Design an enzyme around this catalytic site. Structure first.
Site, PDB file in Angstrom:
ATOM      1  CB  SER A 146      13.542  44.007  34.156  1.00 20.51           C
ATOM      2  OG  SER A 146      13.010  43.659  32.865  1.00 20.51           O
ATOM      3  CE1 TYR A 159      14.627  38.821  35.588  1.00 18.14           C
ATOM      4  CE2 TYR A 159      13.072  40.231  34.425  1.00 18.14           C
ATOM      5  CZ  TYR A 159      14.347  39.995  34.918  1.00 18.14           C
ATOM      6  OH  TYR A 159      15.321  40.861  34.492  1.00 18.14           O
TER       7      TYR A 159
HETATM    8  N1  LIG Z   1      18.413  41.310  28.654  1.00 20.64           N
HETATM    9  C1  LIG Z   1      19.131  41.222  29.736  1.00 20.64           C
HETATM   10  O1  LIG Z   1      20.286  40.749  29.764  1.00 20.64           O
HETATM   11  C2  LIG Z   1      18.503  41.744  30.936  1.00 20.64           C
HETATM   12  C3  LIG Z   1      17.291  42.487  30.762  1.00 20.64           C
HETATM   13  C4  LIG Z   1      16.730  43.193  31.864  1.00 20.64           C
HETATM   14  C5  LIG Z   1      17.315  43.118  33.061  1.00 20.64           C
HETATM   15  N2  LIG Z   1      18.430  42.363  33.238  1.00 20.64           N
HETATM   16  C6  LIG Z   1      18.987  42.308  34.585  1.00 20.64           C
HETATM   17  O2  LIG Z   1      20.357  42.677  34.503  1.00 20.64           O
HETATM   18  C7  LIG Z   1      21.079  41.947  35.534  1.00 20.64           C
HETATM   19  C8  LIG Z   1      22.233  41.258  34.826  1.00 20.64           C
HETATM   20  O3  LIG Z   1      21.662  40.413  33.823  1.00 20.64           O
HETATM   21  P1  LIG Z   1      22.613  39.566  32.881  1.00 20.64           P
HETATM   22  O4  LIG Z   1      21.762  39.321  31.695  1.00 20.64           O
HETATM   23  O5  LIG Z   1      23.901  40.296  32.756  1.00 20.64           O
HETATM   24  O6  LIG Z   1      22.825  38.239  33.700  1.00 20.64           O
HETATM   25  P2  LIG Z   1      23.632  36.875  33.337  1.00 20.64           P
HETATM   26  O7  LIG Z   1      24.446  37.068  32.091  1.00 20.64           O
HETATM   27  O8  LIG Z   1      22.580  35.819  33.446  1.00 20.64           O
HETATM   28  O9  LIG Z   1      24.693  36.853  34.538  1.00 20.64           O
HETATM   29  C9  LIG Z   1      24.136  36.537  35.829  1.00 20.64           C
HETATM   30  C10 LIG Z   1      25.190  36.851  36.868  1.00 20.64           C
HETATM   31  O10 LIG Z   1      24.563  36.681  38.152  1.00 20.64           O
HETATM   32  C11 LIG Z   1      25.184  35.611  38.837  1.00 20.64           C
HETATM   33  N3  LIG Z   1      24.158  34.886  39.561  1.00 20.64           N
HETATM   34  C12 LIG Z   1      23.089  34.240  39.033  1.00 20.64           C
HETATM   35  N4  LIG Z   1      22.352  33.591  39.917  1.00 20.64           N
HETATM   36  C13 LIG Z   1      23.042  33.742  41.110  1.00 20.64           C
HETATM   37  C14 LIG Z   1      22.767  33.239  42.395  1.00 20.64           C
HETATM   38  N5  LIG Z   1      21.685  32.501  42.742  1.00 20.64           N
HETATM   39  N6  LIG Z   1      23.649  33.607  43.338  1.00 20.64           N
HETATM   40  C15 LIG Z   1      24.704  34.363  43.012  1.00 20.64           C
HETATM   41  N7  LIG Z   1      25.050  34.932  41.840  1.00 20.64           N
HETATM   42  C16 LIG Z   1      24.159  34.554  40.903  1.00 20.64           C
HETATM   43  C17 LIG Z   1      25.963  34.797  37.817  1.00 20.64           C
HETATM   44  O11 LIG Z   1      27.022  34.083  38.478  1.00 20.64           O
HETATM   45  P3  LIG Z   1      27.772  32.806  37.706  1.00 20.64           P
HETATM   46  O12 LIG Z   1      28.574  33.419  36.599  1.00 20.64           O
HETATM   47  O13 LIG Z   1      28.574  32.204  38.806  1.00 20.64           O
HETATM   48  O14 LIG Z   1      26.646  31.945  37.117  1.00 20.64           O
HETATM   49  C18 LIG Z   1      26.420  35.932  36.877  1.00 20.64           C
HETATM   50  O15 LIG Z   1      27.573  36.551  37.405  1.00 20.64           O
HETATM   51  C19 LIG Z   1      20.018  41.065  36.255  1.00 20.64           C
HETATM   52  O16 LIG Z   1      19.437  41.733  37.403  1.00 20.64           O
HETATM   53  C20 LIG Z   1      18.951  40.916  35.171  1.00 20.64           C
HETATM   54  O17 LIG Z   1      17.651  40.626  35.690  1.00 20.64           O
HETATM   55  C21 LIG Z   1      19.047  41.699  32.185  1.00 20.64           C
HETATM   56  C1  LIG Z   2      11.966  46.207  28.773  1.00 16.62           C
HETATM   57  O1  LIG Z   2      12.482  44.939  29.061  1.00 16.62           O
HETATM   58  C2  LIG Z   2      12.088  43.931  28.100  1.00 16.62           C
HETATM   59  C3  LIG Z   2      11.251  44.190  26.967  1.00 16.62           C
HETATM   60  C4  LIG Z   2      10.881  43.183  26.071  1.00 16.62           C
HETATM   61  C5  LIG Z   2      11.334  41.879  26.295  1.00 16.62           C
HETATM   62  C6  LIG Z   2      12.174  41.570  27.427  1.00 16.62           C
HETATM   63  C7  LIG Z   2      12.562  42.597  28.336  1.00 16.62           C
HETATM   64  C8  LIG Z   2      13.398  42.262  29.477  1.00 16.62           C
HETATM   65  O2  LIG Z   2      13.749  43.203  30.273  1.00 16.62           O
HETATM   66  C9  LIG Z   2      13.816  40.888  29.681  1.00 16.62           C
HETATM   67  C10 LIG Z   2      14.606  40.537  30.817  1.00 16.62           C
HETATM   68  O3  LIG Z   2      14.772  41.445  31.775  1.00 16.62           O
HETATM   69  C11 LIG Z   2      15.112  39.309  31.124  1.00 16.62           C
HETATM   70  C12 LIG Z   2      14.793  38.271  30.279  1.00 16.62           C
HETATM   71  C13 LIG Z   2      13.974  38.456  29.093  1.00 16.62           C
HETATM   72  C14 LIG Z   2      13.466  39.828  28.782  1.00 16.62           C
HETATM   73  C15 LIG Z   2      12.618  40.224  27.638  1.00 16.62           C
HETATM   74  O4  LIG Z   2      12.210  39.403  26.787  1.00 16.62           O
HETATM   75  C16 LIG Z   2      13.764  37.188  28.307  1.00 16.62           C
HETATM   76  O5  LIG Z   2      13.297  37.099  27.151  1.00 16.62           O
HETATM   77  C17 LIG Z   2      14.171  35.926  28.766  1.00 16.62           C
HETATM   78  C18 LIG Z   2      15.507  36.035  29.539  1.00 16.62           C
HETATM   79  C19 LIG Z   2      16.701  36.548  28.687  1.00 16.62           C
HETATM   80  O6  LIG Z   2      15.791  34.676  30.015  1.00 16.62           O
HETATM   81  C20 LIG Z   2      15.335  37.010  30.720  1.00 16.62           C
END
Ligand SMILES: NC(=O)c1ccc[n+]([C@@H]2O[C@H](COP(=O)([O-])OP(=O)(O)OC[C@H]3O[C@@H](n4cnc5c(N)ncnc54)[C@H](OP(=O)(O)O)[C@@H]3O)[C@@H](O)[C@H]2O)c1
Ligand SMILES: COc1cccc2c1C(=O)c1c(O)cc3c(c1C2=O)C(=O)C[C@](C)(O)C3
Ligand SMILES: NC(=O)c1ccc[n+]([C@@H]2O[C@H](COP(=O)([O-])OP(=O)(O)OC[C@H]3O[C@@H](n4cnc5c(N)ncnc54)[C@H](OP(=O)(O)O)[C@@H]3O)[C@@H](O)[C@H]2O)c1
Ligand SMILES: COc1cccc2c1C(=O)c1c(O)cc3c(c1C2=O)C(=O)C[C@](C)(O)C3
Lengths: 252, 254
Positions: A146, A159
Site C-alpha cells: 500500500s 493496517y
Molecule cells: N484501495 C484499494 O483497494 C487498496 C489500496 C492499497 C492496497 N490494497 C491492497 O490490495 C490488495 C487487494 O485489495 P482489494 O481492495 O482488491 O481487496 P478486496 O476487494 O477487499 O478483496 C479481498 C480479497 O482477499 C480475500 N481475503 C480477505 N481476507 C481473507 C482472509 N482472512 N483469508 C483469505 N482470503 C481473504 C477475499 O476473499 P473473499 O472474497 O472470500 O472475501 C478477497 O478475495 C490487498 O493487499 C490490499 O491491502 C488495496
Molecule cells: C497511497 O495509498 C493511499 C493514499 C491515501 C488514502 C488511502 C491509501 C491506501 O492505500 C488505502 C488502502 O490501502 C486501503 C484502504 C484505504 C486506503 C486509503 O484511504 C481506506 O480508506 C480504507 C479501506 C478501503 O478500507 C482500506
C-alpha cells in the site's frame, strides 16, 4: 503468452485487484489458482471469466490467519495443479489477500492488531515459506502492499503496520531467494476501485480521486497490469523493490 | 507489438543500454531515433540491427552539454520523423545518454570542469530535453530517465557522476507531478553494474569482482535493463509515475 506452462496462485482473487490479477495472468497462459476465504460465488465468477477468455483456472478455499490456513490452501492448490498438469510446481505467488475507513489510533484494540497482522503479514510470510518448496528457479513472489507505508494517515496505522512488515518480507526474502533466481517484489497500490459499494457513490469517488496525481481513482486493472509484468521473465533484473502502482499518490 | 504507431527517442543509443533499449522499442513497433554524440559507426550498427529485425530507425547526431544541443537534436529528430510519418509526434523520450566514467574520479582529484561537464550532460541536458520533448508529446506519453543505483549506494570515486544522477531523479519527481494532468508519466530506471561492451567487461577477474554487487552474483546485461525500460514505455505502466524503478539485479539490498 508470456506465462505459457506456468502455474500461479493469487491469494484473494475472488474480488478486486486479485480478480483483475488472476484474469491477466490467465490471459498470458498461466494456470491460475483463484484463492478466496468464503465468497465461493465470486471465486467461481473469476474462474468462469478466465475460462470464457480461453484460459485455465480453479478455485481454492482457505481462510488465512487461523490455525491450519497454509496447510488447507496447499491441499487445494496441489490437488488442482496435480489434476491439471500431473505436477505441483508453483511458478508465481501473489500475496494479494488482506484485511482492510480505518480505525482511529485511540480506538485500535489488541484483537484488531492481531487480526490485521495474522492475515496481512504473518500469513504472507508462511505462504512464501511453503510456496518455495514447489517453486523452480526463475519463480516470482509478489507482495501487494500500500502507498500508506510512505503516506501518513493516522486512521490506517494498524493496517499500515502490517504492510510495513509485508515490505520487510520483500527485502529480506529477495536476498534469501536470489541464489535460486526467484525474485521478490512489493507492488504498492493507491486507492483502487475493488467493486466495493463506496465506489458506486460519485461524491466520495471524486474526493478519493484527488489522492492520485491523475485525479482519478485506480482501476483494479491498473494495478493488475503492473503485477502481471512483474510475474513475467522481463522483470528478472528487478528484485527486492518497491514498485509504486498508485497513479502518483506519493507525489502529493 | 505494444508500440505500433509510436515514435521514440533514445538518447545515447549508439552503444550499451541505449542500444539495447532502441532495439527493444523497435521490436515492439516503435519508430526509433538513435541518438549519439560522436560514434557514428556504433549508431549505424544500432540502426542496422533494427532494420534487419524488421523495424524502423534513423540516427540523430547531437553532442549534449553544449550551447545549441537540444536545438540540434530536435532538428534531426523532427526532420526524420516528418520524412517517415508526416508528423513530428514524440511518444517516448528515454534520457539514457550520460558522461559515465569506469575509471571514476576520487573526491580529492575532482575538478570544477568535471563537475560542470557531468552536470551539463547528465542533468541539465535531460531537463531541457524534457522541456522541449513535451511540445511534441501527446497525452499518454512516456519520459524515462536512466539513473544509477549509486544514488543509493556510496562509492566515493563516483561522487561527481552520482551528484548528477541525484539531480536527474529530481527531474523525475517534480516533472511527474507537473505532467500528470497531460497523462505523461515520468519515471527513473536505475541500473546497477551493467555490461555496456566496454573493455573492462573483457577482463574476467574484474567482471567477477563487479558481479558481487548484484544479489544474483552476475553483472547486468544491457537487455536486463532495457527490458524494464521497454515495459515502462508501454501502456501497461500507466499507473506508475514519479517512481524509482530498481533494475539493478538486487544491488540495493543494503
Ligand atoms: N484501495 C484499494 O483497494 C487498496 C489500496 C492499497 C492496497 N490494497 C491492497 O490490495 C490488495 C487487494 O485489495 P482489494 O481492495 O482488491 O481487496 P478486496 O476487494 O477487499 O478483496 C479481498 C480479497 O482477499 C480475500 N481475503 C480477505 N481476507 C481473507 C482472509 N482472512 N483469508 C483469505 N482470503 C481473504 C477475499 O476473499 P473473499 O472474497 O472470500 O472475501 C478477497 O478475495 C490487498 O493487499 C490490499 O491491502 C488495496
Ligand atoms: C497511497 O495509498 C493511499 C493514499 C491515501 C488514502 C488511502 C491509501 C491506501 O492505500 C488505502 C488502502 O490501502 C486501503 C484502504 C484505504 C486506503 C486509503 O484511504 C481506506 O480508506 C480504507 C479501506 C478501503 O478500507 C482500506
Ligand atoms: N554499469 C553501467 O553500464 C551503468 C550503471 C548505472 C547506470 N548507467 C546509466 O545507463 C545509461 C547508459 O549507460 P551505458 O553504460 O550504456 O553508457 P555507454 O555505453 O558509456 O554509452 C553512452 C551513450 O551516451 C552517448 N553520450 C555520451 N556522452 C554524450 C554527450 N556528451 N552527448 C550526447 N551523447 C552522449 C554515447 O554516444 P557515443 O557513442 O557517440 O559516444 C553513447 O551512445 C547512462 O545514463 C548511465 O549513467 C550505466
Ligand atoms: C547500483 O549501481 C552501482 C552499484 C555498484 C557499483 C556501480 C554502480 C553503478 O550504478 C555504476 C554506474 O552507474 C556507472 C559507472 C559505474 C558504476 C558502479 O560501479 C562504474 O564503476 C564505472 C562506469 C561503468 O563507467 C560508470
Amino acid at each position: 503468452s508470456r506465462l505459457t506452462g506456468k502455474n500461479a496462485l493469487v491469494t484473494g482473487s475472488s474480488r478486486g485487484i486479485g480478480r483483475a490479477t488472476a484474469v491477466r495472468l490467465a490471459r498470458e497462459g498461466a494456470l491460475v489458482a483463484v484463492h478466496y476465504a468464503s465468497n465461493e460465488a465470486a471465486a467461481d465468477e473469476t474462474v468462469a471469466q478466465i475460462e470464457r477468455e480461453g484460459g485455465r483456472a480453479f478455485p481454492v478455499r482457505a481462510e488465512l490467519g487461523v490455525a491450519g490456513d497454509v496447510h488447507e490452501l496447499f491441499l487445494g492448490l496441489e490437488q488442482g495443479l496435480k489434476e491439471r498438469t500431473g505436477e505441483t510446481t508453483l511458478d508465481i505467488l501473489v500475496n494479494n489477500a488482506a484485511v482492510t475507513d480505518g480505525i482511529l489510533p485511540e480506538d485500535v484494540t489488541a484483537e484488531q492488531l492481531d487480526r490485521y497482522y495474522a492475515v496481512n503479514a504473518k500469513a504472507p510470510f508462511l505462504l512464501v515459506q511453503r510456496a518455495v518448496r514447489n517453486m523452480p528457479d526463475g519463480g516470482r513472489i509478489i507482495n501487494i502492499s500500500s502507498g500508506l507505508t510512505r503516506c501518513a494517515v493516522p486512521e490506517q496505522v494498524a493496517y499500515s503496520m502490517t504492510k510495513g512488515a509485508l515490505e520487510q518480507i520483500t527485502l529480506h526474502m529477495a536476498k534469501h531467494l536470489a541464489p535460486r533466481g526467484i525474485t521478490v517484489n512489493s507492488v504498492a497500490p493507491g486507492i483502487t476501485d475493488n467493486g466495493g459499494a463506496v465506489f458506486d457513490i460519485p461524491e466520495i469517488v471524486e474526493q478519493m480521486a484527488q489522492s492520485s496525481a491523475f485525479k482519478r481513482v485506480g482501476e483494479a486493472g491498473d494495478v493488475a497490469d503492473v503485477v502481471t509484468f512483474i510475474a513475467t521473465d522481463e522483470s528478472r533484473w528487478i528484485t527486492g523493490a518497491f514498485i509504486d502502482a498508485s497513479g502518483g499518490t506519493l507525489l502529493g
